[PDB]
Design a protein around this motif. Sequence first.
Motif, PDB file in Angstrom:
ATOM      1  N   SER B 423       0.823  -1.240   0.000  1.00 35.54           N
ATOM      2  CA  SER B 423       0.000   0.000   0.000  1.00 35.54           C
ATOM      3  C   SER B 423       0.848   1.279   0.000  1.00 35.54           C
ATOM      4  CB  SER B 423      -1.024   0.053   1.125  1.00 35.54           C
ATOM      5  OG  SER B 423      -0.423   0.642   2.233  1.00 35.54           O
ATOM      6  N   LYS B 424       2.140   1.138   0.329  1.00 32.73           N
ATOM      7  CA  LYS B 424       3.089   2.250   0.239  1.00 32.73           C
ATOM      8  C   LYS B 424       3.382   2.548  -1.223  1.00 32.73           C
ATOM      9  CE  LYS B 424       4.728   3.579   4.225  1.00 32.73           C
ATOM     10  NZ  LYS B 424       4.290   2.980   5.520  1.00 32.73           N
ATOM     11  N   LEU B 425       3.830   1.545  -1.982  1.00 27.37           N
ATOM     12  CA  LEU B 425       4.244   1.846  -3.341  1.00 27.37           C
ATOM     13  C   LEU B 425       3.140   1.598  -4.308  1.00 27.37           C
ATOM     14  CD1 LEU B 425       5.096  -1.223  -3.515  1.00 27.37           C
ATOM     15  CD2 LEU B 425       7.334  -0.302  -3.135  1.00 27.37           C
ATOM     16  N   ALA B 426       2.004   2.232  -4.058  1.00 27.27           N
ATOM     17  CA  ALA B 426       0.836   2.165  -4.948  1.00 27.27           C
ATOM     18  C   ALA B 426       0.749   3.345  -5.856  1.00 27.27           C
ATOM     19  CB  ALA B 426      -0.501   2.017  -4.164  1.00 27.27           C
ATOM     20  N   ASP B 427       1.851   4.061  -6.031  1.00 23.34           N
ATOM     21  CA  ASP B 427       1.925   4.984  -7.164  1.00 23.34           C
ATOM     22  C   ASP B 427       2.755   4.405  -8.307  1.00 23.34           C
ATOM     23  OD1 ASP B 427       0.391   6.684  -5.909  1.00 23.34           O
ATOM     24  OD2 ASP B 427       1.871   8.191  -5.325  1.00 23.34           O
ATOM     25  N   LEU B 428       3.480   3.336  -7.973  1.00 22.19           N
ATOM     26  CA  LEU B 428       4.637   2.959  -8.746  1.00 22.19           C
ATOM     27  C   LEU B 428       4.236   3.014 -10.231  1.00 22.19           C
ATOM     28  CD1 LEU B 428       7.476   2.476  -8.268  1.00 22.19           C
ATOM     29  CD2 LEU B 428       7.136   0.277  -7.427  1.00 22.19           C
ATOM     30  N   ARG B 429       5.069   3.593 -11.092  1.00 24.79           N
ATOM     31  CA  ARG B 429       4.868   3.346 -12.508  1.00 24.79           C
ATOM     32  C   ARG B 429       6.084   2.776 -13.217  1.00 24.79           C
ATOM     33  NH1 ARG B 429      -0.378   2.956 -12.378  1.00 24.79           N
ATOM     34  NH2 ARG B 429      -0.977   4.339 -10.621  1.00 24.79           N
ATOM     35  N   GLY B 430       5.865   2.252 -14.427  1.00 22.76           N
ATOM     36  CA  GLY B 430       6.924   1.878 -15.383  1.00 22.76           C
ATOM     37  C   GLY B 430       6.786   2.701 -16.678  1.00 22.76           C
ATOM     38  N   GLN B 431       7.220   2.175 -17.842  1.00 25.13           N
ATOM     39  CA  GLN B 431       7.061   2.940 -19.106  1.00 25.13           C
ATOM     40  C   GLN B 431       6.019   2.327 -19.985  1.00 25.13           C
ATOM     41  OE1 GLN B 431       9.921   2.043 -17.418  1.00 25.13           O
ATOM     42  NE2 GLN B 431      10.873   1.543 -19.385  1.00 25.13           N
ATOM     43  N   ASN B 432       6.196   1.097 -20.341  1.00 20.74           N
ATOM     44  CA  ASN B 432       5.034   0.493 -20.916  1.00 20.74           C
ATOM     45  C   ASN B 432       3.874   0.633 -19.880  1.00 20.74           C
ATOM     46  OD1 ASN B 432       4.863  -2.576 -23.033  1.00 20.74           O
ATOM     47  ND2 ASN B 432       4.007  -0.477 -23.220  1.00 20.74           N
ATOM     48  N   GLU B 433       2.661   0.982 -20.343  1.00 22.80           N
ATOM     49  CA  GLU B 433       1.474   0.540 -19.579  1.00 22.80           C
ATOM     50  C   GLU B 433       1.435  -0.997 -19.371  1.00 22.80           C
ATOM     51  OE1 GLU B 433      -1.653   1.174 -23.218  1.00 22.80           O
ATOM     52  OE2 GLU B 433      -2.519   1.815 -21.259  1.00 22.80           O
ATOM     53  N   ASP B 434       2.199  -1.748 -20.178  1.00 20.94           N
ATOM     54  CA  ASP B 434       2.446  -3.138 -19.870  1.00 20.94           C
ATOM     55  C   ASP B 434       3.214  -3.248 -18.560  1.00 20.94           C
ATOM     56  OD1 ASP B 434       1.035  -4.394 -21.913  1.00 20.94           O
ATOM     57  OD2 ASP B 434       2.685  -4.892 -23.236  1.00 20.94           O
ATOM     58  N   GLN B 435       4.135  -2.353 -18.296  1.00 23.85           N
ATOM     59  CA  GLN B 435       4.975  -2.596 -17.151  1.00 23.85           C
ATOM     60  C   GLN B 435       4.186  -2.270 -15.903  1.00 23.85           C
ATOM     61  OE1 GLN B 435       9.081  -1.351 -19.391  1.00 23.85           O
ATOM     62  NE2 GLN B 435       8.673  -0.584 -17.329  1.00 23.85           N
ATOM     63  N   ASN B 436       3.227  -1.363 -16.108  1.00 24.21           N
ATOM     64  CA  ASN B 436       2.267  -0.955 -15.084  1.00 24.21           C
ATOM     65  C   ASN B 436       1.472  -2.150 -14.610  1.00 24.21           C
ATOM     66  OD1 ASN B 436       2.924   1.844 -15.156  1.00 24.21           O
ATOM     67  ND2 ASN B 436       1.133   2.400 -16.394  1.00 24.21           N
ATOM     68  N   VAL B 437       0.981  -2.951 -15.567  1.00 22.21           N
ATOM     69  CA  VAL B 437       0.232  -4.141 -15.249  1.00 22.21           C
ATOM     70  C   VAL B 437       1.171  -5.029 -14.484  1.00 22.21           C
ATOM     71  CG1 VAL B 437      -1.120  -5.967 -16.128  1.00 22.21           C
ATOM     72  CG2 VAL B 437      -1.336  -3.762 -17.090  1.00 22.21           C
ATOM     73  N   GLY B 438       2.403  -5.104 -14.949  1.00 20.68           N
ATOM     74  CA  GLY B 438       3.435  -5.829 -14.237  1.00 20.68           C
ATOM     75  C   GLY B 438       3.489  -5.374 -12.802  1.00 20.68           C
ATOM     76  N   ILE B 439       3.727  -4.092 -12.576  1.00 13.56           N
ATOM     77  CA  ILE B 439       3.788  -3.623 -11.196  1.00 13.56           C
ATOM     78  C   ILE B 439       2.530  -3.921 -10.360  1.00 13.56           C
ATOM     79  CG2 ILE B 439       4.309  -1.696  -9.717  1.00 13.56           C
ATOM     80  CD1 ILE B 439       5.337  -0.522 -12.615  1.00 13.56           C
ATOM     81  N   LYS B 440       1.339  -3.673 -10.900  1.00 16.91           N
ATOM     82  CA  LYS B 440       0.069  -3.981 -10.218  1.00 16.91           C
ATOM     83  C   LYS B 440      -0.046  -5.496  -9.862  1.00 16.91           C
ATOM     84  CE  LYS B 440      -2.853   0.077 -11.704  1.00 16.91           C
ATOM     85  NZ  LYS B 440      -2.518   0.055 -13.278  1.00 16.91           N
ATOM     86  N   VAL B 441      -0.019  -6.381 -10.871  1.00 16.39           N
ATOM     87  CA  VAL B 441      -0.012  -7.832 -10.645  1.00 16.39           C
ATOM     88  C   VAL B 441       0.808  -8.100  -9.413  1.00 16.39           C
ATOM     89  CG1 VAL B 441       1.177  -9.968 -11.420  1.00 16.39           C
ATOM     90  CG2 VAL B 441      -0.397  -8.752 -12.945  1.00 16.39           C
ATOM     91  N   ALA B 442       2.072  -7.632  -9.427  1.00 15.40           N
ATOM     92  CA  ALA B 442       3.014  -7.873  -8.371  1.00 15.40           C
ATOM     93  C   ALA B 442       2.495  -7.382  -7.051  1.00 15.40           C
ATOM     94  CB  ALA B 442       4.226  -7.193  -8.692  1.00 15.40           C
ATOM     95  N   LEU B 443       2.134  -6.110  -7.008  1.00  9.47           N
ATOM     96  CA  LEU B 443       1.652  -5.462  -5.773  1.00  9.47           C
ATOM     97  C   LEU B 443       0.501  -6.217  -5.194  1.00  9.47           C
ATOM     98  CD1 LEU B 443       1.801  -1.671  -6.137  1.00  9.47           C
ATOM     99  CD2 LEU B 443       3.021  -3.436  -4.825  1.00  9.47           C
TER     100      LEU B 443
END
Lengths: 524, 524, 75
Positions: B423-443
């Motif tokens: 819940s801390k790193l719930a801003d996290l972004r990447g470059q692809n919006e693909d990588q975003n899905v990556g970060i979310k899945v993970a979180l």
Amino acid sequence: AAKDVKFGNDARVKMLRGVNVLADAVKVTLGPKGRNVVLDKSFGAPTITKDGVSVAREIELEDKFENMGAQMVKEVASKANDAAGDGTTTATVLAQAIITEGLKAVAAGMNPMDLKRGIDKAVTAAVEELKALSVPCSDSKAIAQVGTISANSDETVGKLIAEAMDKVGKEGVITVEDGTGLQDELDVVEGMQFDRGYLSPYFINKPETGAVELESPFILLADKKISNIREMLPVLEAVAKAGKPLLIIAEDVEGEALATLVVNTMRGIVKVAAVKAPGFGDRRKAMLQDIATLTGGTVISEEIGMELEKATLEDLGQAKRVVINKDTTTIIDGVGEEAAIQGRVAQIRQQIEEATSDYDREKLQERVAKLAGGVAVIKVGAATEVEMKEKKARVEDALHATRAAVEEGVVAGGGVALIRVASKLADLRGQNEDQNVGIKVALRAMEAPLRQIVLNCGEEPSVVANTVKGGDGNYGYNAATEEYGNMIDMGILDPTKVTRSALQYAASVAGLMITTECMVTDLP
Amino acid sequence: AAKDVKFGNDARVKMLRGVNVLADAVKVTLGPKGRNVVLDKSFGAPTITKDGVSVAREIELEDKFENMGAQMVKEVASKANDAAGDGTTTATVLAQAIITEGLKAVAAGMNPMDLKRGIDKAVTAAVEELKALSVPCSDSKAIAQVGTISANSDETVGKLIAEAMDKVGKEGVITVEDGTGLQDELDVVEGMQFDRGYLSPYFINKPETGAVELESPFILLADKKISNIREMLPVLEAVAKAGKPLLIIAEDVEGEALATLVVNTMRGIVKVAAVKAPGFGDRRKAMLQDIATLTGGTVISEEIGMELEKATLEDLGQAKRVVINKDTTTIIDGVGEEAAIQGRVAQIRQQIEEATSDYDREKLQERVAKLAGGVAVIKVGAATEVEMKEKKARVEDALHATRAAVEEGVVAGGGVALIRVASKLADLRGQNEDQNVGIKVALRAMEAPLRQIVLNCGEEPSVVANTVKGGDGNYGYNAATEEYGNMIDMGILDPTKVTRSALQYAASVAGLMITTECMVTDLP
Amino acid sequence: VASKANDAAGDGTTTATVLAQAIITEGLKAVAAGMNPMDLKRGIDKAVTAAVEELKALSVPCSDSKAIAQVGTIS
Ligand SMILES: [Mg+2]
């Protein structure tokens, strides 16, 4: 080995059918008026039996899963019997009662965790209630009382037990031997019993007690772990020549030498049995020494430089009988002389003076106890061989119910106690209405045995049930004579330990099952 | 052997099912309130267990592929445990969480390489966050703290660990033996431990530690590669006659002689074990010599002209215990005398003066350390055998968590710590919006364990999850008592190493999978 | 339910369906508990006759053009 994995509902359905077949095959034999189950037996004619312990033993199903279900109830119901002397069937009958109804609930979409809670409360409450219904059995009168009832109206069995307890105490180790005349005998004798069991079931020579019975055996008292049969071969040769059996009481006997002695009594070349030594660590070597003194044997402690390669008969202890269980060794009449055995008690006596701690005390007095305290043997006499080893049988039955009655009291025996405790706690609530269902499933499970006895007799359950409920205390129905009355007065009673164990054990596995989500097993 | 080859999607789908089966059998046991899994066992009654490591061990599926799936997740989750002392199940539960979601992504037509990037960032980020949430455990107070919690509110276990570290250092080699009294004991003793493991799993004599435990063994200290059992047969004969086990610490033991000693302890003719010598090359011969000095053994170096054909007992070293792992050998109480052991330290001491390099320094002080620094043995005392070898078990559990806490600290145990960092790193972004899905899945994976504990307890996940998230630091929900609080104060903590390892290891295998394109295996 | 809902107000048919699936699910679970369904029914109805009164109490008239637009819009 690739497994087959079943989940949630599937697992539980499989489990449930598994449990029914055990229970439907085993429950029809519950009353004094049970039905027959026919149990096929490879060569020869089938076995007709009314004995649920025998039916259960045979039950194993094809479907794994279904089978796991049945094996699980069998497991737990056998421990009931393990700790009480009876109830194997009752345990099963009750186990089906909860499992059926609890398991329908879960499937209806109520909460498992709550249903278990509910059941476990109802049990908790009824175990108390039972403690209340329970009548103590403490005096010589009461002892011979439960004894005689437990041995089927035979007043002489009640007496002999009463007398034994009367001589070695309500603890004292009491065994039964085949009698040699027409007269019963009761003798106290030098001996001992300790909490260790056979190291392999294949040692058993009398499968109906599931126990090992060696006559006039030499006793090896080795203080070490026995791994290789090499160390053995001089002693096992001297023993084979004296044409007598042999008991090993060593720290342990492992793999090699173990599987060896196992296949050595399988083909019956030398009858042998081995059991771990009593206790552990420091107080082991003292305790092993005690058995030495008792049987006039020499302890072979590696810590003085003596191998088992240097041991002739003269080292082995000796007793007139020994009997081992799943978990008990009992040595009867040890040849070791009273000059020694008393001397040792005088030694240990003094060690109690130089005790500075309380744990160092009880541990020395449990040792003075086992040793100077003795073993009380009942010889069962009769007219014919058949009678005798039938009478011998009931004598052990009674001894069992009596040991049990002493500890926790007796209650209404027809199921009646359970029926009773249930109609008392018929307000019980929980918080979840799911917990209520749990309580009610448990409560109504408790009528199962009575309902079952009645049924088996071919009378109406509902009707006898309702009238047993309508009364109080130990009013019940005696299915053998079809009379209502005071179940205890009319000689239909269960030790309190056994009714409770039954219930506890049934409830345990039912909870376990109502909370199983996954089931692993091998491929068909 | 003709293979069956599966690609991209097929491959991954097979993998996915494979991993679910592992996870769904295993994850129902996660909480303090897990559910039972029943594990059939060939002869006899099934095993009911709540222990994910046991359930995992049994999982193997029929469909290869699917099986490969499950096997890969087991592999990696077991290394987590290898490196931290726990998390085997958690690692699995998180493994499923990523794999499920990331694998849906790929299949939806997003880019694998980016999804992995995303997840790996989210992990990287939360690993840091964890270091921040982490409370150190350094002083004697804190050590006993995590020890007692980890040994289940037993303050005496906390003490004993705290006390050992206190004598031989937070590094110092600390082992546990069976206790001989009712008293716990702590002794420091000449000994040592080095990073080499058994050369074959078949040496293991205590499968629940998956470890080899030899009592009073002689030690062969050979400086060469042992290939032929011919060279051995005089020494193995002297050893078999003294009826004691034997440890080989040679450069190596190869094929022939290895598979020999293996089948030699299989049928239990002589119990033996062999492990490679510590270190390599120049500093090996010095290090082998150190163990010689420690156990008063003679080193058999081929470079002076001594064969193993010329070695009687008098050459073999000797210690009161030795314990070997997958990857550790630890030698307890060596008989080698203090006249020698101290003398050797005085020799090595001086070698440090004549050090001109830094790498030549630490290497000599790790040697002075192992040798004069010694090994601290805990003996676990208790009342009964059962208690004792249960207490002994928890003492090794705590020792594990403590060693672990020392290194990286402790955090909220409930799943909490992961729920928080996420819940801390719930801003996290990447470059692809693909990588975003990556970060979310993970979180969103990171909630899995908390959600699962709650779920197993039969409470609502979403709701406890949401309220844990609304807090800070180590406020969390203690599933065992249903109270929110400060997870650490409430005694529900995980070593930092262990929550991290779990996450990293689950993320690795998930990446691996999300990036697998082909799958080779044998024909059905 | 959905079909009647619709002949009655031309709206809320899914709500309706959602509510029935809900009464039914729960209601069957209670029959499985060994309650008498005939009573489960009576209680369900009492509950509802009660809820309708409650609604007529929360109801406020909709009679400006603004609210009318809001029901349109939401629909
Ligand atoms: Mg609408």
